[PDB]
């Protein structure tokens, strides 16, 4: 879909350009294919580019838009993912603390040693904290 | 915990079955409260959540959580009794009166519907 | 290997980070003749705090992985100078050697993901 939308620019001029941008924006929203479209995992090394990024530019504003929406829906994980791309490190941890915090209180029998919110917790800490950590103490 | 809400849920079922209330207007209110209660109990969760809970029960390896399933079971029992009675009342009602109150009763029927699906 | 452990590096980095942010935030008050001299001195100190932050940041990076192997292979005649390099030397930098080393960190596989991007950013910014 991205490849096709990109053709829209082929008609060079404003209007069409915005139409292209809106179309991409519309694609990201509601398709919710964030990783594919927007990018993924830092391991330092900024984003690993999404397909759109290869095309480039307005990508930060789209992320904020998507992320806020995620907040409405309460699609946590998506929000965390989105904020990572946003590079709002402090925001990420805070949302993150909330996610891990609940699920901690509850009743027992869980927590395999390999994947979920806890695992997510481990990822971020190892990941951010060593590196020039921008988050609040 | 919406335990306190549970009691209202019971009262609502009681009134509906009784079908007192000249006003369908009253019953529309009952339907609305019931609808929210049914919706509220299961915050949007899907089969994945249920599977995870079952595994944890797995078996009580240690201390499990099976809180939401237990809550759903209690709701469904209450509802059953009252249920046969009230189903009759809710459907007939349906039709008429209240094309209005309708918006409320059909929504109540659908929520209820998931749960007590089966 | 580095003289100081990773935990320690993180500790120092974190602490300096707090200071860096503090001064950065209230820099307007301090900066901007006795008054001017105060301005210069404070400006110098703030720059110093940031500089230490940068050095520590690089080290935070190095701790992540495969630093030791490259070090052994890389060191040449210059090596004697490198080994007797103090932290203050980094604080008040010896730019060329680090640049070469950092380039090797990036060129070689050692830096992973986000880290690598950061050095390239660093070389661009202050290199």
CB of B75 within 8 A of CB of B3? no
Task: Collapse the DSSP code of B60 into the 3-class scheme (helix H, G, I; strand E, B; otherwise coil) and give the result.
Answer: strand
CB of A83 within 8 A of CB of A34? no
- C-alpha B74, offset from chain centre: 10
Residues of A in contact with B63 (CB under 8 A): 107-109
CB of B90 within 8 A of CB of B82? no
Distance CA A24, CA A30 (A): 11
Number of DSSP helices (H) and strands (E) in chain C, helices first: 8, 0
Spell out the alpha helix ranges (H) of chain A. 2-6, 16-31, 34-38, 51-55, 60-73, 78-86, 89-100, 117-129
Token duo for residue A82: 């989105």
Q: Do chains B and C touch (3 or more CB pairs under 8 A)?
A: no
Distance CA A36, CA A1 (A): 12
DSSP secondary structure letter of residue B1: -
Is A113 near chain B, with CB under 8 Å?
Answer: no
Beta bridge partners of B57: B60
Beta bridge partners of A62: none
Residue of chain B whose Cα is closest to the Cα of A112: B56
Angle, CA B31 vertex, CA B26 and CA B33 arms, to 5°: 100
Distance CA C66, CA A61 (A): 37
Distance CA C103, CA C65 (A): 15
Residues of B in contact with A107 (CB under 8 A): 56, 63-67
CB of C26 within 8 A of CB of C83? no
Q: Do the Cβ atoms of A42 and C60 come within 8 Å?
A: no
Q: Do the Cβ atoms of A45 and C17 come within 8 Å?
A: no
Nearest residue to A136 (alpha-carbon basis) of A76, A96, A80, A77: A96
Residue of chain A whose Cα is closest to the Cα of C61: A131
Q: Do the Cβ atoms of C117 and A133 come within 8 Å?
A: no
CA atoms within 13 A on the CB side of A128: 21
Token duo for residue A134: 């921008």
Nearest residue to B5 (alpha-carbon basis) of B32, B40, B46: B40
Distance CA C60, CA C52 (A): 12
CA atoms within 13 A on the CB side of B106: 8
Q: How many CB atoms lie within 10 A of CB B69?
A: 13
Q: Do the Cβ atoms of B58 and A109 come within 8 Å?
A: yes
What is the nearest CA distance from B68 to chain A, expressed in angstroms? 11
DSSP secondary structure letter of residue A40: E
Beta bridge partners of B97: B99
B36 burial via Cβ count (<10 Å: 0-12, 13-18, 19+) = middle
Residues of B in contact with A109 (CB under 8 A): 55-58, 60-65
Q: How many CB atoms lie within 10 A of CB A95?
A: 20
Residues of B in contact with A110 (CB under 8 A): 52, 56, 65
């Amino acid at each position: 879909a991205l490849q096709y939308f990109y053709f829209l620019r082929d008609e060079k001029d404003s209007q069409g350009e915005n139409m292209f941008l809106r179309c991409v924006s519309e694609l990201v929203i509601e398709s919710r294919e964030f990783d594919m479209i927007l990018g993924k995992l830092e391991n330092d090394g900024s984003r690993k580019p999404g397909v759109i990024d290869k095309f480039t530019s307005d990508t930060k504003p789209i992320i904020n838009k998507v992320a806020s929406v995620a907040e409405n829906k309460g699609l946590f994980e998506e929000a965390a993912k989105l904020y990572d791309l946003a590079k709002n490190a402090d925001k990420v941890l805070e949302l993150m603390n909330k996610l891990l915090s609940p699920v901690v209180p509850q009743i027992s029998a869980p927590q395999s040693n390999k994947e979920r919110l806890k695992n997510m917790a481990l990822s971020i800490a190892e990941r951010y904290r060593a590196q020039g950590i921008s988050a609040n103490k | 915990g919406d335990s306190s809400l549970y009691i209202i849920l019971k009262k609502l079922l009681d009134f509906i079955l009784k079908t007192g209330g000249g006003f369908q207007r009253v019953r529309t209110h009952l339907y609305g409260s019931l609808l929210y209660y049914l919706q509220i109990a299961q915050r949007p969760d899907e089969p994945d959540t249920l599977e995870a809970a079952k595994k944890t029960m797995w078996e009580r390896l240690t201390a499990p959580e099976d809180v939401f399933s237990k809550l759903q079971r209690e709701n469904i029992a209450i509802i059953e009794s009252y249920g046969a009675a009230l189903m009759e009342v809710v459907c007939r009602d349906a039709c008429d009166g209240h094309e209005i109150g309708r918006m409320l009763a059909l929504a109540l029927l659908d929520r209820i519907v998931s749960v007590d699906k089966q | 290997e580095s003289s100081v452990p990773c935990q320690l590096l993180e500790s120092v980095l974190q602490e300096l980070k707090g200071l860096q942010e503090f001064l950065d935030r209230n820099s307007q008050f301090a900066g901007g003749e006795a008054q001017l001299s105060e301005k210069i001195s404070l400006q110098a100190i703030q720059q110093l705090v940031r500089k230490s932050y940068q050095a520590l940041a690089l080290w935070k990076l190095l701790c992540e992985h495969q630093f030791t192997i490259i070090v052994a292979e890389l060191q040449k005649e210059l090596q004697e100078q490198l080994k007797i390099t103090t932290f203050k030397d980094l604080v008040i930098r010896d730019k060329e050697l680090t640049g070469a080393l950092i380039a090797s960190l990036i060129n070689c596989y050692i830096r992973d993901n986000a880290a690598v991007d950061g050095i390239s950013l660093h070389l661009q910014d202050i290199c």
